[PDB]
Write an enzyme that holds these catalytic residues in place. Structure first.
Site, PDB file in Angstrom:
ATOM      1  N   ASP A  58       0.799  -1.225   0.000  1.00 26.85           N
ATOM      2  CA  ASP A  58       0.000   0.000   0.000  1.00 26.85           C
ATOM      3  C   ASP A  58       0.834   1.279   0.000  1.00 26.85           C
ATOM      4  O   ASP A  58       0.378   2.299  -0.523  1.00 26.85           O
ATOM      5  CB  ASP A  58      -0.924   0.028   1.232  1.00 26.85           C
ATOM      6  CG  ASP A  58      -1.920   1.162   1.196  1.00 26.85           C
ATOM      7  OD1 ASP A  58      -1.895   1.953   0.262  1.00 26.85           O
ATOM      8  OD2 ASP A  58      -2.749   1.302   2.105  1.00 26.85           O
ATOM      9  N   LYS A  59       2.033   1.245   0.571  1.00 25.99           N
ATOM     10  CA  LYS A  59       3.009   2.323   0.728  1.00 25.99           C
ATOM     11  C   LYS A  59       2.668   3.316   1.839  1.00 25.99           C
ATOM     12  O   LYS A  59       3.565   4.026   2.289  1.00 25.99           O
ATOM     13  CB  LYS A  59       3.257   3.102  -0.580  1.00 25.99           C
ATOM     14  CG  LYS A  59       4.394   4.123  -0.491  1.00 25.99           C
ATOM     15  CD  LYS A  59       3.924   5.533  -0.085  1.00 25.99           C
ATOM     16  CE  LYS A  59       5.068   6.516  -0.063  1.00 25.99           C
ATOM     17  NZ  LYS A  59       4.598   7.857   0.374  1.00 25.99           N
ATOM     18  N   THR A  60       1.453   3.318   2.385  1.00 24.56           N
ATOM     19  CA  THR A  60       1.144   4.143   3.553  1.00 24.56           C
ATOM     20  C   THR A  60       0.641   3.216   4.645  1.00 24.56           C
ATOM     21  O   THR A  60      -0.361   2.513   4.460  1.00 24.56           O
ATOM     22  CB  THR A  60       0.122   5.246   3.253  1.00 24.56           C
ATOM     23  OG1 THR A  60       0.639   6.105   2.230  1.00 24.56           O
ATOM     24  CG2 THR A  60      -0.152   6.086   4.498  1.00 24.56           C
ATOM     25  N   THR A 103      -0.804   1.470  -4.965  1.00 22.70           N
ATOM     26  CA  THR A 103      -1.194   2.598  -4.120  1.00 22.70           C
ATOM     27  C   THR A 103      -1.907   3.654  -4.949  1.00 22.70           C
ATOM     28  O   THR A 103      -1.393   4.080  -5.983  1.00 22.70           O
ATOM     29  CB  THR A 103       0.033   3.195  -3.433  1.00 22.70           C
ATOM     30  OG1 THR A 103      -0.359   4.289  -2.596  1.00 22.70           O
ATOM     31  CG2 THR A 103       1.029   3.688  -4.456  1.00 22.70           C
TER      32      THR A 103
HETATM   33  N1  LIG Z   1      -8.279  11.838   4.683  1.00 19.38           N
HETATM   34  C1  LIG Z   1      -7.870  12.321   3.334  1.00 19.38           C
HETATM   35  N2  LIG Z   1      -8.663  13.369   2.958  1.00 19.38           N
HETATM   36  C2  LIG Z   1      -8.463  13.963   1.758  1.00 19.38           C
HETATM   37  N3  LIG Z   1      -7.469  13.515   0.922  1.00 19.38           N
HETATM   38  C3  LIG Z   1      -6.679  12.475   1.293  1.00 19.38           C
HETATM   39  C4  LIG Z   1      -6.872  11.869   2.501  1.00 19.38           C
HETATM   40  N4  LIG Z   1      -5.966  10.875   2.625  1.00 19.38           N
HETATM   41  C5  LIG Z   1      -5.207  10.858   1.495  1.00 19.38           C
HETATM   42  N5  LIG Z   1      -5.655  11.843   0.701  1.00 19.38           N
HETATM   43  C6  LIG Z   1      -5.277  12.355  -0.660  1.00 19.38           C
HETATM   44  O1  LIG Z   1      -6.037  11.544  -1.729  1.00 19.38           O
HETATM   45  C7  LIG Z   1      -5.072  10.372  -2.109  1.00 19.38           C
HETATM   46  C8  LIG Z   1      -5.621   9.028  -1.433  1.00 19.38           C
HETATM   47  O2  LIG Z   1      -4.851   8.535  -0.318  1.00 19.38           O
HETATM   48  P1  LIG Z   1      -5.055   6.917   0.080  1.00 19.38           P
HETATM   49  O3  LIG Z   1      -3.832   6.144  -0.327  1.00 19.38           O
HETATM   50  O4  LIG Z   1      -6.254   6.384  -0.679  1.00 19.38           O
HETATM   51  O5  LIG Z   1      -5.333   6.779   1.691  1.00 19.38           O
HETATM   52  P2  LIG Z   1      -4.595   5.660   2.701  1.00 19.38           P
HETATM   53  O6  LIG Z   1      -3.494   4.974   1.969  1.00 19.38           O
HETATM   54  O7  LIG Z   1      -4.019   6.375   3.882  1.00 19.38           O
HETATM   55  O8  LIG Z   1      -5.614   4.612   3.169  1.00 19.38           O
HETATM   56  C9  LIG Z   1      -3.900  10.737  -1.741  1.00 19.38           C
HETATM   57  O9  LIG Z   1      -3.072  10.948  -2.930  1.00 19.38           O
HETATM   58  C10 LIG Z   1      -4.034  12.178  -0.943  1.00 19.38           C
HETATM   59  O10 LIG Z   1      -3.571  13.231  -1.834  1.00 19.38           O
HETATM   60  F1  ALF Z   2      -3.786   2.269   1.918  1.00 21.79           F
HETATM   61 AL1  ALF Z   2      -2.935   3.353   0.779  1.00 21.79          AL
HETATM   62  F2  ALF Z   2      -2.060   4.452  -0.339  1.00 21.79           F
HETATM   63  F3  ALF Z   2      -1.434   3.182   1.705  1.00 21.79           F
HETATM   64  F4  ALF Z   2      -4.448   3.559  -0.189  1.00 21.79           F
END
Ligand SMILES: Nc1ncnc2c1ncn2[C@@H]1O[C@H](COP(=O)(O)OP(=O)(O)O)[C@@H](O)[C@H]1O
Ligand code: ALF
Ligand SMILES: *[C@@H]1O[C@H](CO)[C@@H](O[C@@H]2O[C@H](CO)[C@@H](O[C@@H]3O[C@H](CO)[C@@H](O)[C@H](O)[C@@H]3O)[C@H](O)[C@H]2NC(C)=O)[C@H](O)[C@H]1NC(C)=O
Ligand SMILES: *[C@@H]1O[C@H](CO)[C@@H](O)[C@H](O)[C@H]1NC(C)=O
Ligand SMILES: *[C@@H]1O[C@H](CO)[C@@H](O)[C@H](O)[C@H]1NC(C)=O
Lengths: 869, 328
Positions: free
Chosen positions: A196-198, A463
Site C-alpha cells: 500500500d506504501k502508507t 497505491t
Molecule cells: N483523509 C484524506 N482526505 C483527503 N485527501 C486524502 C486523505 N488521505 C489521502 N488523501 C489524498 O487523496 C489520495 C488518497 O490517499 P489513500 O492512499 O487512498 O489513503 P490511505 O493509503 O491512507 O488509506 C492521496 O493521494 C491524498 O492526496
Molecule cells: F492504503 Al494506501 F495508499 F497506503 F491507499
C-alpha cells in the site's frame, strides 16, 4: 451438534469420501479381504483430531457470542490430483493383476484341489470378485492420514509466525498474526507481493513540514520554537520565519483561510477536557495537517452536530456546518460546506491533485506554479494534498440541499444519490496550492526489499497515492536501482500495440491507475472481448517478469482487480501485504493476505491471512517461516507417499507368490497404525523443525528461497520417484527375506520360515527403513527429532511385542493373531542378519545416491551447510 | 495486538541441534566398515553354510523310470514308494527331518483365511459355530467340521521313513522323534484344544472330520500330549508358509549316545507312504536331511548376499574416493 462437522468434512474432499466408499466395500463378507479396522481406525483419527483442530474455534465463538449478549492451496490442488492418480493406478493394477489372476484360477486354480471346493466359478468371474480384493487389499495406497497431517503441519508452522520475537513490534505491542492457518507452504512459494506504501512502507507518523500557498514555498530555512500563543503548543520545531510572521500581522486573505481550511475541512475528534486541545484523527493526514494549523494559531476548538467553534488568533468564531461531503477511498477527497456567522455559506475542499485537478476553475494564476510545486515536494517523499475552496451564491445552495434531504432519509438504501450530488457543484473550485507532509520509511524496509529481491520474490507496490512519493520511496527502500529502466506509459501503448498487429537485473515501469484501465479497455463484442484480453494477458506478462512495478492511482476496486489478473492469468502464487479499509479487497484476492496494523484502522488486518506490524517483518515470514514451511511441507509429502507406496506394494509382490490372490503381506493391525503411529510422528516433527540452515543463516542467504518458487523439491515426477523408489524398496523388503526364506533362515526346533515371520521381517525392515529414511532426511537433528525417529522405531517394536504377546491373543484371537512371531523372528541372528541386510540394501543405495547426487549436484543448502560459518 | 511473545528456543526456532553433514570423511568410512564387516560375515555365513552336510530327495514319482510311478494312480489306496540313497559324508550333531512341497500355494488369499483361528484356540462357541472364513468346509453333512478350513482339511499326510542298509543288507530303522518340530509358542499359545474334559473323544462331540482327512482329529497321535489341535505336524502344516515352494520340519534326529556320527556315511533307503497328490497341478514332494550348524542353517543366499553387498559396499566406497579427490 458435532455430527454436522464431519458431514461436510467428507464430501468436499476427494479422499475423505474415498475411504468412506471403501468402508462399505470392505463391509460385505463377499469381498472382505482387509477388515474394516484397517480403514475405520485410521479414518477416525484423520477425521477425529482434524475436527478437534477446528472444534476449538467453534467453541470459542459460542462463548464470545453468549456472555456478550475461499482460499485454496497449490499443494492442496496437487494432492487431490494425486489421490486421483492413486485411484487410476490402484484400479489399473487391480485390473492389471486381474488378468494375471484370471489365468491362475483356470490353469492352476482348477486343478489345484487344495483350492477348488465345489461351487461353479468361472476363471473370469473369480477375477471379478478379486478385483474388489485388489482394490481393498491395496487401499492404503491413498494416504489415509494425509489431510490430517497437512492441517497440523500448517497449524504448527502458522504459530511460529505468530510467536516470532523478531516479528514483534516494540512500542505498539503488535506481534505478528497468522489469521489463516491454511496456506503456510505457500509462504515459501510466493512469487508476487503487493503493498500500500502508507502504513505498509511508512510509519504513519506524519509531522507537517512544508506547504505551498499562492505558488510560494514555505518551510525552508530563511530570515525557532513556537512561543507566542497558548494554542501553539510547542511540539514542532519549525523554520522559515517568514511564514511565522506572515500570520502575526499583515495577514493575506489567501494565507489566512489556508490554515483555516486545515482546521475545518476534516473529521477529527477534537478534545477540550484535557485543556491542551488534543486531536484524535481517524486518518493520518487530517490529524497532522490540523495540528499544523493550531501551531500557526488556527486552532480548532470544538464541533457540534451542526456548529463548529474554530478559533483564529483567539478570535473564537463559530461556523454553522450544515452538510459534510465525507471522504471515501473511492472518491479520494473531502469537502465541507459551512455557514459563516456573517451570513454567507463557504465551501472548502481538500485531497489528491488528480481528483481535484479534474475540477479546477476555468483559469487560476496558481495553476502552473502549483503543478510544478507538488512534484518538488513529492521528489523527497512528501504526501502533498491540494487544498481549494469556493463561495457559492445562496441560489446555488437552494437546489443543492433538497437532494440531500431526499438522500438524507436513511431508509433501506442510501448509497447512490450521495455520489451524484457531491460531483456536480464541486466541478468548479478555487485553488491555493498544496500542502506537504513527510512520512519516512519505517526502519528495516530497505533490508527486506533488498533481501526478498535476492530471494527472487517479485515485489509490487499498489497505491492510489502520488506516482512520485512511492517512486521516490522505491529508491529509498531499494525497490529500484540504477540498472532498472523505469519508463512512462506513453511507450507502452505504442509498444503493446506494435506487438499486437504483429499477432493480428530488474525491469520496472511507472504508470497510473487512471491510465491503467485504459490499457485494459474498461461480432464486434466477441472480437473486442478477445482484443483487450490479449492486451490483458500480454501486459501481465510484461508485468510478471518484473520484481518492481509502480502501479498507482488505483482505487480499492482496482486493488483486487490487479491481484485477480496475475493470480488467474498466470497461476502464480500471490501474497499481499496491505493497509487500511481501502485494501481489504485485494487481500481477499491474493492467495496469501497480509495486512499491516498501521495507524489507519484494523480493516486490512481483519481481512487478511497473516498480519503483523512492520513490512521489515516480511523477511522472517518468507525467508524463515515461508521457506522452512515449504521445505518442511513438501519434504513431508515425499516421505509420506513413499512410506505408503513402499508399504502396500509388498502386497503386489507377495501377490505373485500366492496365486495373484491379493493376500496381506503384513499383520492385520500393521496397516492401521502404520499411517498414524509408526511413521506419523517423525515426519511431523520434520515438518515443524527441519531447518536446512539456521534462522540467522536463513536470512543471511536469501537464495535458498528458489526451491519453493520453482517447486524443485516436489513435482509430479517426484511423486512417482516416491513410488518407484517405493517399488524398489518394497521389492527389497519382500525379496530379500524371500531369498532368505526360500532356504533355511535358522531352521531349528524354533524354525521361523512361515508367512507370519515373513510378515514380521518385512514389517521390521519397513519401519527401520523408513524411520531411518526420515532420519536420513532431517537436516536439523534436534533432540526431539532424534527422539521422534528412535522413539518411533522403539514405538513400533514396543507395541509389536504387546501385539505379539500371549496376553493380547486371548483378548482378540480372531483379530490379534500374530503371536510370538517377533519374539521368534527377532531372536534369530539370521533374521536380523537379514533385516540388517534388507535395511542396509534399502539405505546404503539411498545414502550412496544422496551422497552421489549431493556431490555431482550439490544442493543450495548443501553448499551453504558445508561451512561452519 | 497482544503482549510480547515469550522468548523460548522452541517458539523462536533456535533449539539446540546437531547438523549432520554428509562429508567424505563421514560417508566414506561407514561404507568401508560396512564393506569390511559384510565381507567377513559373508565369508562366515557362506563357509558355515557350505560346511552343512545336506541331502535332498524327490519322491513324487511323476517322471518315468522312477520305481514308484504306480503311485500316480493308486488303484489300491495305500501306495508305497521306495528310494535308495547313499551318504558320502557323515552327519555330526542332531539331524533335522524335513518335507517339501513345490508349486503348492499354501498362501492363497482364499486359502489362508480358511481357518476359524478362534476355533483353533479351543473356543467352545467356535467349534459348533465355525466362522464364515472356513465357509466351504464348515460342515460335512449336518454338523460342523471342527478342523474347519481348506488348509486344515488339505493336510500333508505322507509318512517318510529312513532305514539304514548295513553291510548285512538287513534294514536298520532310524530313530525319528515327533516332538519339538514346532515353536514353543504355537504348542501352548496359538493352538489349543477345547476346554474341560479328559479324553479328546468326548471333547470333540458334534463335529465331523474334514472331508480329506481319512481319520478324525481325535487320535492324530497316540500320545495325548500331541493329539488334537496341538498336533505337532498340524501346527507346522497349518502355520502357512510364505511361498509356493516351501519346506517344513517333519521330525528330529537327536545325537546318539555313542561317539559315532548320527548318520554315518553309507547307503540308506527311503520308504514313503505316498498319500499326497501333487502331480495334478505340477507339484512335487521332497525329503531333506540336514545337520545343525551352531550359526543357524544352510543359507547360501545370505552368505552370497553379504559377499555380494559387502563387496559392492567396498566397490562403492573405493569409487567415492576418486570423485572426492577430483572435486577437492
Ligand atoms: N483523509 C484524506 N482526505 C483527503 N485527501 C486524502 C486523505 N488521505 C489521502 N488523501 C489524498 O487523496 C489520495 C488518497 O490517499 P489513500 O492512499 O487512498 O489513503 P490511505 O493509503 O491512507 O488509506 C492521496 O493521494 C491524498 O492526496
Ligand atoms: F492504503 Al494506501 F495508499 F497506503 F491507499
Ligand atoms: C491324504 O490326503 C489326501 C488329500 O490329497 C486324501 O485324498 C482325498 O480323500 C478324500 C476322501 O477321503 C476325497 O474326497 C472325496 O472322497 C469321496 C469318497 O469318499 C469321493 O467320492 C469324492 O470324489 C472325493 O474325492 C478327495 O477327493 C481326496 N483328494 C483328492 C485330491 O482327490 C486322502 O484320503 C488322505 N489319506 C490319508 C490316509 O490321510
Ligand atoms: C533299492 O533297494 C532295494 C532293496 O535293497 C532293491 O530291491 C531295489 O532294486 C533298489 N533300487 C534301486 C534303483 O537301486
Ligand atoms: C514300507 O512301509 C510299509 C508301511 O509300514 C511297510 O508295510 C513295508 O513293508 C515297508 N517296506 C517296503 C514297502 O519295502
Amino acid at each position: 451438534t458435532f455430527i454436522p462437522m464431519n458431514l461436510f468434512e467428507q464430501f468436499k474432499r476427494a479422499a475423505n469420501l474415498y475411504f468412506l466408499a471403501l468402508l462399505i466395500l470392505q463391509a460385505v463378507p463377499q469381498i472382505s479381504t482387509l477388515a474394516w479396522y484397517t480403514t475405520l481406525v485410521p479414518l477416525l483419527v484423520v477425521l477425529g483430531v482434524t475436527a478437534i483442530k477446528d472444534l476449538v474455534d467453534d467453541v470459542a465463538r459460542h462463548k464470545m457470542d453468549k456472555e456478550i449478549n475461499f482460499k485454496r492451496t497449490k499443494i492442496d490442488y496437487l494432492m487431490n490430483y494425486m489421490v486421483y492418480t492413486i485411484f487410476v493406478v490402484l484400479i489399473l493394477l487391480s485390473a492389471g493383476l486381474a488378468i494375471g489372476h484370471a489365468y491362475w484360477e483356470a490353469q492352476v486354480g482348477n486343478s489345484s484341489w487344495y483350492l477348488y471346493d465345489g461351487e461353479d466359478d468361472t476363471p473370469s468371474y473369480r477375477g471379478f470378485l478379486i478385483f474388489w480384493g485388489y482394490i481393498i487389499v491395496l487401499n492404503t495406497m491413498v494416504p489415509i492420514s494425509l489431510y490430517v497431517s497437512v492441517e497440523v503441519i500448517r497449524l504448527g508452522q502458522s504459530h511460529f509466525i505468530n510467536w516470532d520475537l523478531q516479528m514483534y513490534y516494540a512500542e505498539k505491542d503488535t506481534p505478528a498474526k497468522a489469521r489463516t492457518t491454511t496456506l503456510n507452504e505457500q509462504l515459501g512459494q510466493i512469487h508476487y507481493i503487493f503493498s500500500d506504501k502508507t502504513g505498509t512502507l511508512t510509519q504513519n507518523i506524519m509531522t507537517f513540514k512544508k506547504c505551498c500557498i499562492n505558488g510560494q514555498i514555505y518551510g525552508d530555512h530563511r530570515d525557532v520554537d513556537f512561543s507566542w500563543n497558548t494554542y501553539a503548543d510547542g511540539k514542532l520545531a519549525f523554520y522559515d520565519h517568514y511564514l511565522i510572521e506572515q500570520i502575526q500581522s499583515g495577514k493575506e486573505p489567501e494565507v489566512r483561510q489556508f490554515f483555516f481550511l486545515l482546521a475545518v475541512c476534516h473529521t477529527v475528534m477534537v478534545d477540550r477536557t484535557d485543556g491542551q486541545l488534543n486531536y484524535q484523527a481517524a486518518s493520518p493526514d487530517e490529524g497532522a495537517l490540523v495540528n499544523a494549523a493550531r501551531n500557526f494559531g488556527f486552532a480548532f476548538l470544538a464541533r457540534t452536530q451542526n456548529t463548529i467553534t474554530i478559533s483564529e488568533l483567539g478570535t473564537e468564531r463559530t461556523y454553522n456546518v450544515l452538510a459534510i461531503l465525507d471522504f471515501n477511498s473511492d472518491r479520494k477527497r473531502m469537502s465541507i460546506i459551512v455557514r459563516t456567522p456573517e451570513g454567507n455559506i463557504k465551501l472548502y475542499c481538500k485531497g489528491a491533485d488528480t481528483v481535484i485537478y479534474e475540477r479546477l476553475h476555468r483559469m487560476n494564476p496558481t495553476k502552473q506554479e502549483t503543478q510544478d510545486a507538488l512534484d518538488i515536494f513529492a521528489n523527497e517523499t512528501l504526501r502533498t494534498l491540494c487544498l481549494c475552496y469556493k463561495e457559492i451564491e445562496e441560489k446555488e445552495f437552494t437546489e443543492w440541499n433538497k437532494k440531500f434531504m431526499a438522500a438524507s432519509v436513511a431508509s433501506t438504501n442510501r448509497d447512490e444519490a450521495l455520489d451524484k450530488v457531491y460531483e456536480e457543484i464541486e466541478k468548479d473550485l478555487i485553488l491555493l496550492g498544496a500542502t506537504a507532509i513527510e512520512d519516512k520509511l519505517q526502519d528495516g524496509v530497505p533490508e527486506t526489499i533488498s533481501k526478498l529481491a535476492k530471494a527472487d520474490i517479485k515485489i509490487w507496490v499498489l497505491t492510489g497515492d502520488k506516482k512520485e512519493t512511492a517512486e521516490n520511496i522505491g529508491f529509498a527502500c531499494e525497490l529500484l536501482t540504477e540498472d532498472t529502466t523505469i519508463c512512462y506509459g506513453e511507450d507502452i501503448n505504442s509498444l503493446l500495440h506494435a506487438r499486437m498487429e504483429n499477432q493480428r537485473g530488474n525491469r520496472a515501469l511507472i504508470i497510473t491507475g487512471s491510465w491503467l484501465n485504459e490499457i485494459l479497455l474498461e461480432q464486434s463484442k466477441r472480437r473486442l472481448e478477445a482484443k483487450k484480453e490479449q492486451r490483458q494477458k500480454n501486459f501481465v506478462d510484461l508485468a510478471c517478469e518484473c520484481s518492481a512495478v509502480i502501479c498507482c492511482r488505483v482505487t480499492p476496486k482496482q486493488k483486487a482487480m490487479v491481484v485477480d489478473l496475475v493470480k488467474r492469468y498466470k497461476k502464480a502464487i500471490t501474497l499481499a501485504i496491505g493497509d487500511g479499509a481501502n485494501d481489504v479487497n485485494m487481500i481477499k484476492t491474493a492467495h496469501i493476505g497480509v495486512g499491516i496494523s498501521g495507524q489507519e484502522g484494523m480493516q486490512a488486518v481483519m481481512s487478511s491471512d497473516y498480519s503483523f506490524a512492520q513490512f521489515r517483518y516480511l523477511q522472517r515470514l518468507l525467508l524463515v517461516h515461508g521457506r522452512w514451511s515449504y521445505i518442511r511441507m513438501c519434504k513431508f509429502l515425499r516421505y509420506f507417499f513413499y512410506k505408503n507406496f513402499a508399504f502396500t506394494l509388498v502386497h503386489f509382490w507377495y501377490s505373485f507368490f500366492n496365486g495373484y490372490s491379493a493376500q496381506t503381506a503384513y499383520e492385520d493391525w500393521f496397516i492401521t497404525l502404520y499411517n498414524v503411529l509408526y511413521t506419523s510422528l517423525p515426519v511431523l516433527l520434520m515438518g515443524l523443525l527441519d531447518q536446512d540452515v539456521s534462522d540467522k543463516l536463513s536470512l543471511r542467504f536469501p537464495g535458498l528461497y528458489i526451491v519453493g518458487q520453482r517447486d524443485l523439491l516436489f513435482n509430479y515426477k517426484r511423486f512417482f520417484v516416491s513410488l518407484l523408489h517405493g517399488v524398489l524398496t518394497s521389492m527389497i523388503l519382500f525379496f530379500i527375506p524371500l531369498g532368505a526364506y526360500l532356504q533355511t533362515v535358522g531352521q531349528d526346533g524354533e524354525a521361523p520360515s512361515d508367512y507370519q515371520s515373513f510378515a514380521v521381517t518385512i514389517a521390521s525392515a519397513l519401519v527401520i527403513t523408513v524411520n531411518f529414511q526420515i532420519g536420513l532426511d532431517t537436516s536439523y537433528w534436534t533432540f526431539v527429532n532424534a527422539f521422534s525417529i528412535f522413539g518411533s522405531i522403539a514405538l513400533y517394536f514396543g507395541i509389536m511385542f504387546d501385539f505379539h504377546s500371549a496376553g493380547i491373543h486371548v483378548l482378540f484371537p480372531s483379530a490379534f493373531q500374530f503371536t510370538g512371531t517377533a519374539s521368534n523372528a527377532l531372536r534369530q541372528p539370521y533374521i536380523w542378519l537379514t533385516i540388517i541386510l534388507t535395511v542396509a540394501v534399502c539405505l546404503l543405495p539411498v545414502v550412496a545416491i544422496r551422497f552421489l547426487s549431493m556431490t555431482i549436484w550439490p544442493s543450495e543448502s548443501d553448499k551453504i551447510q558445508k561451512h561452519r560459518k | 495486538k497482544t503482549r510480547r511473545p515469550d522468548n523460548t528456543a522452541f517458539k523462536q526456532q533456535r533449539l539446540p541441534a546437531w547438523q549432520p553433514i554428509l562429508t567424505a570423511g563421514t560417508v566414506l568410512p561407514i561404507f568401508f566398515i560396512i564393506g569390511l564387516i559384510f565381507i567377513p560375515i559373508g565369508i562366515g555365513i557362506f563357509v558355515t553354510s557350505n560346511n552343512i552336510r545336506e541331502i535332498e530327495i524327490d519322491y513324487t514319482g511323476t517322471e518315468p523310470s522312477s520305481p514308484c510311478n504306480k503311485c500316480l494312480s493308486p488303484d489300491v489306496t495305500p501306495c508305497f514308494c521306495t528310494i535308495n540313497f547313499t551318504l558320502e559324508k557323515s552327519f555330526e550333531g542332531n539331524v533335522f527331518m524335513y518335507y517339501g512341497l513345490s508349486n503348492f500355494y499354501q498362501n492363497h488369499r482364499r486359502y489362508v483365511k480358511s481357518r476359524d483361528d478362534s476355533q483353533l484356540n479351543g473356543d467352545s462357541s467356535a467349534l459348533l459355530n465355525p466362522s464364515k472364513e472356513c465357509e466351504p468346509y464348515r460342515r460335512n453333512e449336518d454338523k460342523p467340521i471342527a478342523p474347519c478350513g481348506a488348509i486344515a482339511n488339505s493336510m500333508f499326510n505322507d509318512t517318510l521313513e529312513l532305514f539304514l542298509i548295513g553291510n548285512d543288507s538287513y534294514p536298520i530303522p532310524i530313530a525319528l522323534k515327533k516332538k519339538g518340530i514346532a515353536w514353543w509358542t504355537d504348542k501352548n499359545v496359538k493352538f489349543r484344544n477345547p476346554p474341560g474334559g479328559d479324553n479328546l473323544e468326548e471333547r470333540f462331540k458334534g463335529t465331523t472330520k474334514p472331508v480329506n482327512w481319512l481319520k478324525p482329529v481325535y487320535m492324530l497321535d497316540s500320545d495325548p500330549d500331541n493329539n488334537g489341535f496341538i498336533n505337532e505336524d498340524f501346527i507346522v502344516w497349518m502355520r502357512t508358509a510364505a511361498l509356493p515352494t516351501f519346506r517344513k520340519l517333519y521330525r528330529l534326529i537327536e545325537r546318539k549316545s555313542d561317539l559315532h556320527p548320527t548318520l554315518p556315511a553309507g547307503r540308506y533307503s527311503l520308504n514313503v507312504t505316498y498319500n499326497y497328490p501333487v502331480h495334478y497341478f505340477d507339484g512335487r514332494k521332497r525329503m531333506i536331511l540336514s545337520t545343525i550348524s551352531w550359526m543357524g542353517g544352510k543359507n547360501p543366499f545370505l552368505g552370497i548376499a553379504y559377499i555380494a553387498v559387502g563387496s559392492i559396499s567396498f566397490l562403492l566406497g573405493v569409487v567415492l574416493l576418486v570423485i572426492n579427490h577430483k572435486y577437492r
